[PDB]
Design a protein around this nucleic acid. Structure first.
Lengths: 95, 190, 65
DNA sequence: AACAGGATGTATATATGTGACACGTGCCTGGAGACTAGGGAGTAATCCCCTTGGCGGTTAAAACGCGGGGGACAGCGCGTACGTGCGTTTAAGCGGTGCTAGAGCTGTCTACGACCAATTGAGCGGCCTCGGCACCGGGATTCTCCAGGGGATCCGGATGCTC
DNA sequence: GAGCATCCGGATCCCCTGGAGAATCCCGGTGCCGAGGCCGCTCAATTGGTCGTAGACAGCTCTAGCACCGCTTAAACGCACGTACGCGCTGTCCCCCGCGTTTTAACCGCCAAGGGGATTACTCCCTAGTCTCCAGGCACGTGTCACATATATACATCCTGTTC
């Protein structure tokens, strides 16, 4: 099981499968942490946390899709910190 | 093509032309690089320091030859007379286009059996007292063709028969007995 | 379009997976929507050709890596 | 030249619950009916302004091939950096209780609708006058061309071995 | 002692470094003179503002029950170690162009005026929705029963991926 080619097997399974990749409560306590600084004792419903998680997962997946094309552009495969800089700024997010 | 580059620094260059006398063999300015190319004796070729050393016997130390070599290499590339090898194993080794024809790469076995027998021929008599004799273990047929014993044996017979000079044939029993005499000196008996 | 995906997916009831598949497959539907997030939609396979080293994993010059 | 190995993907019958529907009652709200009624549109003449081209007179942007510098593509390569293999530990769900306020009932005040005439604002509407912008004559600014004695490092030259 | 092509030290010359005057250029900094923002006279319907009254949406008051913060164990996931090659990065110049420099005059461009067609003011009349002012059917919850496919299990058995 070569580590480079096994990752290709994961791509086929994860793209085919539909599920929440990140943990629920660690994300639930994460969003609660941010809310406390913005507004102390700001409560969340179960639906709100899941909606935030799914939007965050899709947003991160899209960034991974774009950064993947940045790697092949530089005649490379792996993602480097330079890849995330080019993708974010060109979308009008970073600057 | 400004004056400070066409008359101000010129006099040095036309003054020193076609005077590599110390290397008597092919002293022409255009032929120094090529002479180094044949003298290198390697498959990859000569790198920068190798070609500099091979050119350097005298008459060349490099007040401006360091950049003149690059300019001449550009001229030779424009002429299309240079073939080279890339990679970090050979740091820009260069060769002159000596009809060492380029072809498809695949088919590189990791041995050279035909020339593998030469080191044993060099070693065995040299390890003995009788020094390495003339190249008589295999004849010129070895690089005429590449065949087995019957075809490599019939051809020497024709080689000797076509030369019908009796006087020439007399030498094969006057130059060979020297080996017989030296077989007394190198081994003590037989 | 989603209903055809369910038969291809060996399922009867339409799941959010088929909703994404119907939208993604039709390029005209991509212009209408696709800058959005679909709950449990999934992602259509988009494997790139830079991966999958179809050539022998041994070195190009020789067998040794 | 091509077989072994261990797990993942297949059929095929096998269990369950939650998701789904079907009754059976119950009750507003959303559609439907059918005229009287005042205000945005179909439909006629009016009127100037907008686009289509004559129609010449210089001038600053294309159009294209050659030249010599250099930067993207691509070859190998030694060592750095990230994904498999195996393990225990502690982070996750349950899913009945209990406790905040979101959401839903009463009844009254409040700024916001609505008719009806006078009265300041603020472009039109054709009439005159002005201060910074932009075109155009002059030179100021780094690179480019010259003149000096010789120097240190080169191209010119001196010197070494075995039959 | 000679002859030949590999290295070594002799002596005569010219290009790095540096500071200016040569005359070019290109690019900045004053001169000059039109056209679009202003000031002043008038010209009037929108449009706030005013005078004088009436019909409801929304903060109080507070109710009744459902939907989240702790409780309380029970399983399984994630987190952590090392070892190895896949793959950054350097070094290097094929070789194929982007850019500079000249022709080259035709193309973009603005000056002094007309017309035919089309986009807003002004006047007339007209057919949907819109208050009257009432009526009855759909379609949404609360109980009450009773099911059908999704989601994973027991047997039984092949394809794929990555090495030696």
């Amino acid at each position: 099981y070569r580590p480079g080619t096994v990752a290709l097997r994961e791509i086929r399974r994860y793209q085919k499968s539909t599920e929440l990749l990140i943990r629920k409560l660690p994300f639930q306590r994460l969003v609660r942490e941010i809310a406390q600084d913005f507004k102390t004792d700001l409560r969340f419903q179960s639906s709100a946390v899941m909606a935030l998680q799914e939007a965050s997962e899709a947003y991160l997946v899209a960034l991974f899709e774009d950064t993947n094309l940045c790697a092949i552009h530089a005649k490379r495969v792996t993602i480097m910190p330079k890849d995330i800089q080019l993708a974010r700024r060109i979308r009008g997010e970073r600057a | 093509m400004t004056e400070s580059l066409v008359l101000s620094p010129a006099p040095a260059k036309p003054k020193r032309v076609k005077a590599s006398r110390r290397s008597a063999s092919h002293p022409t300015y255009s032929e120094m690089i090529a002479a180094a190319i044949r003298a290198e004796k390697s498959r990859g070729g000569s790198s920068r320091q190798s070609i500099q050393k091979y050119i350097k016997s005298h008459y060349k130390v490099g007040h401006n030859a360091d950049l003149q070599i690059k300019l001449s290499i550009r001229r030779l590339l424009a002429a299309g007379v240079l073939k080279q090898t890339k990679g970090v194993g050979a740091s820009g080794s260069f060769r002159l286009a000596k009809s060492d024809k380029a072809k498809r790469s695949p088919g590189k076995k990791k041995k050279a059996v035909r020339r593998s027998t030469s080191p044993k021929k060099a070693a065995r008599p040299r390890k003995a007292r009788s020094p390495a004799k003339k190249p008589k273990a295999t004849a010129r047929k070895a690089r005429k063709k590449s065949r087995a014993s019957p075809k490599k044996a019939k051809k020497p017979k024709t080689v000797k028969a076509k030369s019908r000079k009796a006087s020439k044939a007399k030498k094969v029993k006057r130059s060979k007995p020297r080996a017989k005499s030296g077989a007394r000196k190198s081994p003590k008996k037989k | 379009l989603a209903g055809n995906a369910a038969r291809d997916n060996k399922k009867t009831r339409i799941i959010p997976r088929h909703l994404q598949l119907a939208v993604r497959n039709d390029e005209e539907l991509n212009k209408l929507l696709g800058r959005v997030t679909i709950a449990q939609g999934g992602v259509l396979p988009n494997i790139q050709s830079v991966l999958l080293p179809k050539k022998t994993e041994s070195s190009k010059s020789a067998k040794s890596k």
